[PDB]
Amino acid sequence: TDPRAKWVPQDNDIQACDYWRHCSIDGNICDCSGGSLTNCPPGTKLATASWVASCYNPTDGQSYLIAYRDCCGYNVSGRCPCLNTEGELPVYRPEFANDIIWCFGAEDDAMTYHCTISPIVGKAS
Amino acid sequence: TDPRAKWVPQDNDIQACDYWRHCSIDGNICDCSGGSLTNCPPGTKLATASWVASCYNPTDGQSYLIAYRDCCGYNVSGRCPCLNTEGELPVYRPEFANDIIWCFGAEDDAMTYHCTISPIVGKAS
Amino acid sequence: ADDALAALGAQLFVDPALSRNATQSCATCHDPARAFTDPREGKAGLAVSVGDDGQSHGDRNTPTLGYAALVPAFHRDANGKYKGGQFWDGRADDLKQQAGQPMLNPVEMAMPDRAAVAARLRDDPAYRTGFEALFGKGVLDDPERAFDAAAEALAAYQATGEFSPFDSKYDRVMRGEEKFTPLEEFGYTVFITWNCRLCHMQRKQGVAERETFTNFEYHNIGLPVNETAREASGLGADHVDHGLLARPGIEDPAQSGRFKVPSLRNVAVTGPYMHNGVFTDLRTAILFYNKYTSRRPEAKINPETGAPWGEPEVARNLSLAELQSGLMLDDGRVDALVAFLETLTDRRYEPLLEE
Amino acid sequence: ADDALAALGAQLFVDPALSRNATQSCATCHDPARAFTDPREGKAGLAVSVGDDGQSHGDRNTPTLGYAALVPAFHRDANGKYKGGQFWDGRADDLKQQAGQPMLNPVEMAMPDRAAVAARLRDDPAYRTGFEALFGKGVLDDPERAFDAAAEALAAYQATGEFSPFDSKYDRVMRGEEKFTPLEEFGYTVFITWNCRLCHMQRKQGVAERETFTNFEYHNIGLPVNETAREASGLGADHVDHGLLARPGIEDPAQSGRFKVPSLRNVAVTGPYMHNGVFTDLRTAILFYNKYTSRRPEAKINPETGAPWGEPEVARNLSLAELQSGLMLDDGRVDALVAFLETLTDRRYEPLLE
Amino acid sequence: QETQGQAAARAAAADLAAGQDDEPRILEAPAPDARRVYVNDPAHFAAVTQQFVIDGEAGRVIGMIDGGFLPNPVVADDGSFIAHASTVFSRIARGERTDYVEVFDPVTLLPTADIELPDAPRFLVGTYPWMTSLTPDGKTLLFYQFSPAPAVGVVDLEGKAFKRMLDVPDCYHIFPTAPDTFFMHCRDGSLAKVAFGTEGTPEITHTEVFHPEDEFLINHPAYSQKAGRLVWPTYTGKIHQIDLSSGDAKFLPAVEALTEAERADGWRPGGWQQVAYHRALDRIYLLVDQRDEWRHKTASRFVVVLDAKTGERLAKFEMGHEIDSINVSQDEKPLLYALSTGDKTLYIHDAESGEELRSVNQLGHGPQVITTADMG
Amino acid sequence: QETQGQAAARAAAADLAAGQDDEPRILEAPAPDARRVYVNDPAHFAAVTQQFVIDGEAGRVIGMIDGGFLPNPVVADDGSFIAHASTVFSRIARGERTDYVEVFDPVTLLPTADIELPDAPRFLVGTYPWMTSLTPDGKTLLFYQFSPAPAVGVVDLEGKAFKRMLDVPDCYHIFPTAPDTFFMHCRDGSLAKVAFGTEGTPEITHTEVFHPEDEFLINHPAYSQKAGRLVWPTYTGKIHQIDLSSGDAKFLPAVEALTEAERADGWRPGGWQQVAYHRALDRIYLLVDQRDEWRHKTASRFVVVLDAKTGERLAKFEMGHEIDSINVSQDEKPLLYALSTGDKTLYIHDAESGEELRSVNQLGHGPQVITTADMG
Numbered sequence A, B: 001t002d003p004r005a006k007w008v009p010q011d012n013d014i015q016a017c018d019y020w021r022h023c024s025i026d027g028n029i030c031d032c033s034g035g036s037l038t039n040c041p042p043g044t045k046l047a048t049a050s051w052v053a054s055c056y057n058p059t060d061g062q063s064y065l066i067a068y069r070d071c072c073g074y075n076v077s078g079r080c081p082c083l084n085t086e087g088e089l090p091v092y093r094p095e096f097a098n099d100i101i102w103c104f105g106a107e108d109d110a111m112t113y114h115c116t117i118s119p120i121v122g123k124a125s
Numbered sequence C: 001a002d003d004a005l006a007a008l009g010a011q012l013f014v015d016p017a018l019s020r021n022a023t024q025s026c027a028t029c030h031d032p033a034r035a036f037t038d039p040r041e042g043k044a045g046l047a048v049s050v051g052d053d054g055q056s057h058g059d060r061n062t063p064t065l066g067y068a069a070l071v072p073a074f075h076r077d078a079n080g081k082y083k084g085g086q087f088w089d090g091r092a093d094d095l096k097q098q099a100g101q102p103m104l105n106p107v108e109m110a111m112p113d114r115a116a117v118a119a120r121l122r123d124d125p126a127y128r129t130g131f132e133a134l135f136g137k138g139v140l141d142d143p144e145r146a147f148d149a150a151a152e153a154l155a156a157y158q159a160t161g162e163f164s165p166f167d168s169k170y171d172r173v174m175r176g177e178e179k180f181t182p183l184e185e186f187g188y189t190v191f192i193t194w195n196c197r198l199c200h201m202q203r204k205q206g207v208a209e210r211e212t213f214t215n216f217e218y219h220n221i222g223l224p225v226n227e228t229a230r231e232a233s234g235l236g237a238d239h240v241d242h243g244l245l246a247r248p249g250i251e252d253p254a255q256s257g258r259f260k261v262p263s264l265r266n267v268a269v270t271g272p273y274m275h276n277g278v279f280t281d282l283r284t285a286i287l288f289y290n291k292y293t294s295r296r297p298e299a300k301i302n303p304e305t306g307a308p309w310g311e312p313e314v315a316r317n318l319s320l321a322e323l324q325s326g327l328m329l330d331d332g333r334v335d336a337l338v339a340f341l342e343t344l345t346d347r348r349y350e351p352l353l354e355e
Numbered sequence D: 001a002d003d004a005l006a007a008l009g010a011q012l013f014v015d016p017a018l019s020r021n022a023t024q025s026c027a028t029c030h031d032p033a034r035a036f037t038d039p040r041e042g043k044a045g046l047a048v049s050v051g052d053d054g055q056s057h058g059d060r061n062t063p064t065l066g067y068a069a070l071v072p073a074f075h076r077d078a079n080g081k082y083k084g085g086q087f088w089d090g091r092a093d094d095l096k097q098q099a100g101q102p103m104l105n106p107v108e109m110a111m112p113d114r115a116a117v118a119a120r121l122r123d124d125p126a127y128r129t130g131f132e133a134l135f136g137k138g139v140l141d142d143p144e145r146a147f148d149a150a151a152e153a154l155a156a157y158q159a160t161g162e163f164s165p166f167d168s169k170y171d172r173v174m175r176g177e178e179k180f181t182p183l184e185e186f187g188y189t190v191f192i193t194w195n196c197r198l199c200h201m202q203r204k205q206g207v208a209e210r211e212t213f214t215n216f217e218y219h220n221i222g223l224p225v226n227e228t229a230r231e232a233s234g235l236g237a238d239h240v241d242h243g244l245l246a247r248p249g250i251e252d253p254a255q256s257g258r259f260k261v262p263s264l265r266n267v268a269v270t271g272p273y274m275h276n277g278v279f280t281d282l283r284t285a286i287l288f289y290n291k292y293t294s295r296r297p298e299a300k301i302n303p304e305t306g307a308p309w310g311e312p313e314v315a316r317n318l319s320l321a322e323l324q325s326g327l328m329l330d331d332g333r334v335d336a337l338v339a340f341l342e343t344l345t346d347r348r349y350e351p352l353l354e
Numbered sequence E, F: 001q002e003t004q005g006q007a008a009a010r011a012a013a014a015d016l017a018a019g020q021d022d023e024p025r026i027l028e029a030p031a032p033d034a035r036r037v038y039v040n041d042p043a044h045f046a047a048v049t050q051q052f053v054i055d056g057e058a059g060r061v062i063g064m065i066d067g068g069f070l071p072n073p074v075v076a077d078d079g080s081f082i083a084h085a086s087t088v089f090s091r092i093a094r095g096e097r098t099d100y101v102e103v104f105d106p107v108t109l110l111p112t113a114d115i116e117l118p119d120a121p122r123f124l125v126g127t128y129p130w131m132t133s134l135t136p137d138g139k140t141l142l143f144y145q146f147s148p149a150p151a152v153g154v155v156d157l158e159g160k161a162f163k164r165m166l167d168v169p170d171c172y173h174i175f176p177t178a179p180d181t182f183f184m185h186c187r188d189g190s191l192a193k194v195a196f197g198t199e200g201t202p203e204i205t206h207t208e209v210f211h212p213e214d215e216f217l218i219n220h221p222a223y224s225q226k227a228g229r230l231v232w233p234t235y236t237g238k239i240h241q242i243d244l245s246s247g248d249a250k251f252l253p254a255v256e257a258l259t260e261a262e263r264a265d266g267w268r269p270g271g272w273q274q275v276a277y278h279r280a281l282d283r284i285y286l287l288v289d290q291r292d293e294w295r296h297k298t299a300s301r302f303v304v305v306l307d308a309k310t311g312e313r314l315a316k317f318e319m320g321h322e323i324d325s326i327n328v329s330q331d332e333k334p335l336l337y338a339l340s341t342g343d344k345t346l347y348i349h350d351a352e353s354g355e356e357l358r359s360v361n362q363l364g365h366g367p368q369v370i371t372t373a374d375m376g
């Protein structure tokens, strides 16, 4: 609730903005509009582009590479809005930038933003 | 503020939902987005249709017929939203019904609802 | 004074001695028993009136003089709209400017000149007495003064309460003395929520003190030529009635085919309707407005002939923004407007409302 | 034990006596000095290899044997994509089924038949003893058993830590023992956020325990013909290499022109690239991917020829969803990718980088 | 006790612990069922709008569907598809208007049809469910037009094409009863039966006037197509029930949702979807509260529940929130859905005890319309 | 003390009492002036968005403009027109994408140009004012394209036509310095100068690399076209000032917004439009608060005002609200505009003393970008 304080990850609620994997999420958690943590809601199109972050997992003390992928071709969901910025760099380091609509590669050239999934893509560093 | 209480008109602030002329308004007060009590905001188009109501003017003890006209061809303003239904009858008595988008006759076939104006058209009888 | 000038106009009004053949007074065409309109049949029915020669027909319908005293003098407001005046094309500034015209008009009362009118006013000893007490000695001896003075007396007379008593059911209902029937109340609501109120209410907003159901503007509602009237008047198959453009001094081609919005007071008993008396029934004048709104075939057909309404006499500068309201009056709403419009009938003409 | 079995395959692997003229062994083409690929220049450069006969050329580039032991046995998964197997077209199920084919392939080792392979195994007293200790007495007198035991010993040898040592810099960085240079780390980041990690990672998500930079799937990336390699193979200018569709049993035309996703381990030291050797430079291999994304004139051009890439050898079943990422790899990212890939070289081949 | 976001946290950690792989993809929504509920959000007249597809049992959003300006949602009772009539303009809320119907697969939510309506003929009004309506066979969608005159537009969903406008009397709403027949309610107090072909003047028949000029019938009657029951409250909680199941109108006895003492104390219905009808239970649910007589669109805090045959009150629930709209699942042990336009939340109640069960928050900007499929 | 609503109630009361008539009509917005402020609402990625046109002095909404998906608003410094690069889709957020430029008359707000941009070329991103920019002559709009590679689109507002795409290296943002020239910021830490003749490859010079790998420059630098002053805060509050008045980039002394002390107590810039620059006062305004190093997009409660020349701190303002974006009018005795995404309110402060004067609430869903014209 203190938005300026260091962000404190938890590994117990994926729909909350402090879930560990959402460390550099921007927009809306897909799990809140019929997607899941790592899948898009029906009717939307999964981008192949991502921005990444190394997100600390309180649980195993390990850092994981989370490659956020957008689910596209719908109007923004309006549910579980979240913006975190752990390790988020400015647009000129696009690989780590999260204002960008990461919808590239999405079916049907879908480019509108609906929500963001939080898959692990490897070990950090 | 008790939404179920009898509505009490005032003749001292036109942006408040209890302003006397808004006794059957539905939507937004044009004065809150660049129009005025009886004029449309720039870029929007004035409907010629209207629904009417007899609204009590507590300044003069007289009841006036207010024929509300919509300003159309913009997305809803989102400012000074109000819904009042004094004497408001169902859709089948459309001259007294206020869910209808009264945008007919607006220039350029504009039919999107932006806000509503509250001109007097006569005295009540 | 105000009593006496009027009283003198009263006499002039009814005096055939102001026409060439002495067959015709203002009252002949503007008959008090019919809301100051012409009950007589000409070659175009009641569309147009016959002058003093018993032959010549006018090209426009004789309008009521009731409530004409409420019309502002002709002017252009700041929103560049012409407003007010007298005649259908507002070519006279006011009642006094208008009054002398029927007198010298060969299609109407047909006196050859002001002098011939003055000579008439001298032959009557009561006019010598009457005009001299209001305007001075030997006023009848000066054709200009005599003719101006007759016009003045006639204008004063038309401004009496007698011409505009405001004693219709609508007035009684607005003063609280009675209520509308359910049909009239529905008519009333329609009228003030549909496009009629954009033209046939004095003000754009607020409440008028002496409503006469017109905003005094000029509008081309796209009426066709009235062929029989136009044939009777002898103006020719190629003639166009340009409305307000015909006012000397109006050059603007956007004014072509625009006519002054009539007061709808007494509308019920002063058919036929529009500037060329083209429509017989009140209902037909109302149904005309549907040609701009309705999608149905029947909306393009004049119920009185079964044929299309007709190409506009003037096919430009139509009030499309006001006329194309996007909403069609159904028969329920039409019936309701007739009922409402009948409530605008002055008290003394409520007997004619029987028909 | 698996020790002894592997030790026997290690003898067989370097033994030219399993070729017709006794001029070549698995190691001739899969030269352990070159990440188990062929250094030898032919009628078609290093694009294809020359067999025992001194003139026959293959129509495919000799792949590394490093990490091939991590590839699953051939199978179709439940989302309907074939995965695993051996050869560029997955025509072998596993290392065992693969091993014997070179021995009997006329354009390679060219033994006539299994019996001739057995006869050669009998000439060496040390084979009698090694084989018999592992598979029992008289194994070498039965050609079928001999040949199969040979293929098994070869497969076991290729499954030793020697072929898949995971001692590359990439492995050492992921163990926390060292860091990537800024450029390598950029390349790694680019690799995992761009379309590359849609085919060149084991998993779709989660962390792989032994990453070999291939999901083992089959994709037609739309490569043209290697015109000289094709000329040298003498397969004909009419011939189309349909990749996976060539595996017996595969009938589905959606698989025509599809090849197994190579493991990118040691990629820096096993050029030329792709199933046909068409690209001599790693950088070319990477730039090839821009042809689906870049709108710039130069992306249509193979930098090694100066000319257009060439139509695909097989112009259907292109992996368009994956390849048309909508994003073009600029010079910087291509540089960073080269750096990243180089970190996938085994410790013993770090000298081969230069 | 454990929330769905907690369950999902726990399952992701366990997949990570076990190295279980999973391909990221587009989910399919669970099969439509009785406890699926759609909440439409007219967003207080915004030019674009959202419907939320919700699993009422879990209280989980299982899907969404975008719409345009004040769309009319419909949901095939049988669960086979959903559709809406919707309106877009070429420049957000200006320019060329296109009215169109989309039909959607109810699992993938992909549009399987996009049908242009010519001449932008939709009635733009705050969403009345019964202003666009599916025939019982699901092959035709009927939409009201008001301008230039009341009319009903016919859309063939199976051949994916607009068919025609029908001219109708001065009447409102569309309660289909047959593939070619629907009723409307007329200004003169009658119902009109409209029977229409592919061409020709529709057969139009009026019932008698069933209510006085001064009894006001609300804009959100409940109509159960499968029961042909039209439940029409008045401003006073007087309930008109019309049985249209014979294919003509049979006027049922009027019931009062509120007692005389309650009415003496200012109890009146109020809200948006003020009334719901449970078909299987033959039960009427009316949002009521103490309110001035012209506060008929404000939220209400109480649902009365009454036997549709006797008018007997069975329950009066205190909803504990400001409710604008109610609806019920049509299965046994129905859910009573209670949508707060103010809270943008669907409260999901047990309709028997009125207990709040769970809720779905964050449903757009001004959600107003609840639709359930009658599947059983 | 009288509010605008109250003053309006009295004028209307008096018109009614006096029997004054007036025509209902479409108002013109007051002439654009220095205190006109535009608030854009990217609406948290919603498919349609709004621009509020605000009279800064009166704290009154004087008009609005609708936009599509994450549109880029621009405002001609001379007040003669506004424009946006916008994005629509044929079905709310799905289907054929049309990117376009509209130019608007700043008093009727009517569009005067609608210029289609071939091939959906716009960069879609949280709104960065300097991703779409007007050249100083107002004749050309330049918009950034990211896909498939960095590029800049050239739009002729005078002939109302798209012209061509410009190839550029790995660079970002568009800072027009002239009719044919704009700078960008590059991944290698240089600025690129792009000069576009008429035809073929633009001429691209690079500057000196002016910051290391690990000095992070914000997505919303302030840029004053008429000053040629590029003002670029880093995450730490280190502010790069670049001069572009000569045509080529002269690097000004780098300056610090927070103290070396202050940075040690966790004072960091943070928000959206973190920095404002007053042209005539040569002055920098920065939103700062005590925050973790990776909470750089969160709201801030304080504004620091520093001398652009020396780096001296002129004021510290306790804004009294969670502010995300600031900007200032460019007149004398400037207003300091403080936009709270959270409150959806433009708080209008006196820039001298930080006092809150007035505010305009209800500015959409998540308003973010404040634009002002620089008029004198």
Ligand code: HEC
Pocket (backbone or CB within 6 Å): C013, C024, C025, C026, C027, C028, C029, C030, C049, C050, C051, C052, C058, C060, C061, C062, C063, C064, C065, C068, C085, C086, C087, C088, C089, C095, C098, C099, C100, C102, C103, C107, C108, C109, C154
């Ligand atoms: C029949 C031959 C008439 C006689 C005699 C008089 N009038 Fe008349 N009047 C007549 C017509 C056909 C018209 C309209 C012609 C046109 O060009 O529009 C009129 C008009 C008036 C008006 C104007 C009313 C209005 O515009 O609403 C007035 C005030 C008027 N007439 C008065 C009048 C008087 C005072 C007369 C005797 C002095 C008189 N009229 C004679 C038809 C005939």
Ligand code: HEC
Pocket (backbone or CB within 6 Å): C194, C195, C196, C197, C198, C199, C200, C218, C219, C220, C221, C223, C259, C260, C261, C262, C263, C264, C267, C270, C272, C273, C274, C275, C276, C282, C285, C286, C289, C319, C322, C323, C337
């Ligand atoms: C301005 C665009 C108008 C609107 C909207 C309506 N009316 Fe009208 N009306 C108008 C004019 C200019 C005229 C005279 C036209 C001519 O050239 O003659 C009229 C006339 C009538 C009449 C006949 C009156 C008479 O002849 O004495 C009637 C009965 C009438 N108008 C009624 C009417 C109704 C009921 C309307 C709403 C449907 C309506 N008018 C609209 C100008 C305009």
Ligand code: HEC
Pocket (backbone or CB within 6 Å): D013, D024, D025, D026, D027, D028, D029, D030, D049, D050, D051, D052, D058, D060, D061, D062, D063, D064, D065, D068, D085, D086, D087, D088, D089, D095, D098, D099, D100, D102, D103, D107, D108, D109, D154
């Ligand atoms: C040159 C003439 C070769 C000799 C001798 C051997 N191999 Fe080979 N190998 C060669 C080529 C051109 C290919 C690819 C051909 C194709 O059809 O795709 C191969 C392939 C393999 C593989 C599969 C590796 C993979 O798919 O990633 C294995 C496991 C393999 N070869 C091993 C192998 C052994 C054990 C040999 C001695 C018995 C041997 N090869 C000989 C080229 C040549």
Ligand code: HEC
Pocket (backbone or CB within 6 Å): D194, D195, D196, D197, D198, D199, D200, D218, D219, D220, D221, D223, D258, D259, D260, D261, D262, D263, D264, D267, D270, D272, D273, D274, D275, D276, D282, D285, D286, D289, D319, D322, D323, D337
């Ligand atoms: C699936 C659609 C793929 C994507 C996306 C990428 N690669 Fe790939 N790669 C793929 C296949 C099926 C093959 C073999 C192609 C053939 O038919 O021969 C390859 C090959 C390479 C190579 C050559 C390696 C070798 O020959 O041993 C390299 C260096 C390579 N690929 C790299 C690479 C990079 C860096 C990518 C992202 C830009 C990438 N590939 C995408 C399958 C797919």
Ligand SMILES: [Ca+2]
Pocket (backbone or CB within 6 Å): C037, C061, C062, C063, C270, C271, C272, C273, C274, C277
């Ligand atoms: Ca008449």
Ligand SMILES: [Ca+2]
Pocket (backbone or CB within 6 Å): D037, D061, D062, D063, D270, D271, D272, D273, D274, D277
């Ligand atoms: Ca190779």
Ligand code: NA
Pocket (backbone or CB within 6 Å): C244, C245, C246, C247, C248, C249, C250, C251
């Ligand atoms: Na003239």
Ligand code: NA
Pocket (backbone or CB within 6 Å): D044, D045, D047, D226, D227, D228, D229, D278
């Ligand atoms: Na070659």
